[PDB]
Design an enzyme around this catalytic site. Structure first.
Site, PDB file in Angstrom:
ATOM      1  N   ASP A 177       0.821  -1.205   0.000  1.00  0.00           N
ATOM      2  CA  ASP A 177       0.000   0.000   0.000  1.00  0.00           C
ATOM      3  C   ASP A 177       0.858   1.260   0.000  1.00  0.00           C
ATOM      4  OD1 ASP A 177      -1.894   1.970   0.301  1.00  0.00           O
ATOM      5  OD2 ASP A 177      -2.497   1.395   2.338  1.00  0.00           O
ATOM      6  N   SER A 181      -0.380  15.535 -12.157  1.00  0.00           N
ATOM      7  CA  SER A 181      -0.626  15.160 -13.539  1.00  0.00           C
ATOM      8  C   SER A 181      -0.844  16.408 -14.386  1.00  0.00           C
ATOM      9  CB  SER A 181      -1.841  14.227 -13.628  1.00  0.00           C
ATOM     10  OG  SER A 181      -2.237  14.025 -14.972  1.00  0.00           O
TER      11      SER A 181
END
Length: 330
Positions: A35, A199
């Site tokens: 994770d 992004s």
């Protein structure tokens, strides 16, 4: 040193991925959920409330000759999906894919919430976010990656998740045969303890690319792709019959639909998520309403590049002094 381990979807939808981990002496092998969105290595154990164990493999520290109770230490964690767990702490030897850390904090669950109990395939979590998020008190503990870092050939690990198939976590090296083209690297902020990056934009299907900054985290422990409501609306508008359902808890679509791809930007590069990756199947057995793999982050408070996005790429988690993230197509 290096390590290399195969990671395997827990079910036919890729709801999560499990990776075998050797704990203790002799080895006790548990299948953990790696994770990159948290920083605790915790396991089902002989200390876990018996009624909260249902099929998981447990760690029994009393059977490990290298286990040592970390005196006074406790832990307690709550995840973004509302699940939780808590307990005490041992140090022990932990190996992943041939890579061994001695003195790793192994957090032994005394309590787990129902979603963990109900998932028989996940024996615990192995956190790979920054150690500043580790919940052990009163002495915060380091992640497996943090402990291994200095010994690694290169201070990196890579995530290569499969679509409806196994993939690979590597530690300490970049497998140049595992991706196509080049790896594009992008800046990381560690200010919130996450692999947080920005992004450069998105496209829906064969549509034009929208240049826009989207701050989010690379999170292998989250199944879906959570993006701003504007972006998510633009995606599902291209699917006839798709709608946001408050009763279901997100966007659903007719199972008869063909889903468009979704592209996200990494610097000047582009990662394409095939439409099929965005299908998470009937909302309930036999339903013709299917759950979407792209969902709104509104009210999460953060955008999350979860498995839906990451499995479309070869992803480098670069733990150099100034961390960065790398993405390649594959």
């Amino acid at each position: 040193s290096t390590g290399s381990a195969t990671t395997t979807p827990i079910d036919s939808l890729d709801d999560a991925y499990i990776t075998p981990v050797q704990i203790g002496t002799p080895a006790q092998t548990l299948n953990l959920d790696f994770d990159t969105g948290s920083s605790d290595l915790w396991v089902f154990s002989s200390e876990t409330t018996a009624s909260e164990v249902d099929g998981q493999t447990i760690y029994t520290p009393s059977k490990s000759t290298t286990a040592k109770l970390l005196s006074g230490a406790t832990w307690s964690i709550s995840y973004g999906d509302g699940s939780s767990s808590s307990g005490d702490v041992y140090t022990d030897t932990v190996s992943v894919g041939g890579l061994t850390v001695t003195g790793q904090a192994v957090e032994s669950a005394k309590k787990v919430s129902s979603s963990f109990t109900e998932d028989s395939t996940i024996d615990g979590l192995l956190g790979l976010a920054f150690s500043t998020l580790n919940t052990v008190s009163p002495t915060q503990q380091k992640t497996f990656f943090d402990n291994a870092k200095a010994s690694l050939d290169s201070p990196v690990f890579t995530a290569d998740l499969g679509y409806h198939a196994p993939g690979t976590y590597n530690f300490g090296f970049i497998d140049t045969t595992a991706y196509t083209g080049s790896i594009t690297y992008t800046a990381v902020s560690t200010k919130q303890g996450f692999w947080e990056w920005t992004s450069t934009g998105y496209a829906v299907g064969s549509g034009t690319f929208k240049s826009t900054s989207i701050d989010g985290i690379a999170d292998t422990g989250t199944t879906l792709l959570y993006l701003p409501a504007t972006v998510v609306s633009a995606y599902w508008a291209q699917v006839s019959g798709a709608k946001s359902s408050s009763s279901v808890g997100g966007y659903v679509f007719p199972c008869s639909a063909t889903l468009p791809s979704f592209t996200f930007g990494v610097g000047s590069a582009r990662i394409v998520i095939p439409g099929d990756y965005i299908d998470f199947g009937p909302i309930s057995t036999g339903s013709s309403s299917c759950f979407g793999g792209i969902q709104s982050s509104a009210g999460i408070g953060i955008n999350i590049f979860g498995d839906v996005a990451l499995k479309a790429a070869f992803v480098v988690f670069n733990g150099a002094t100034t961390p960065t993230l790398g993405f390649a197509s594959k």
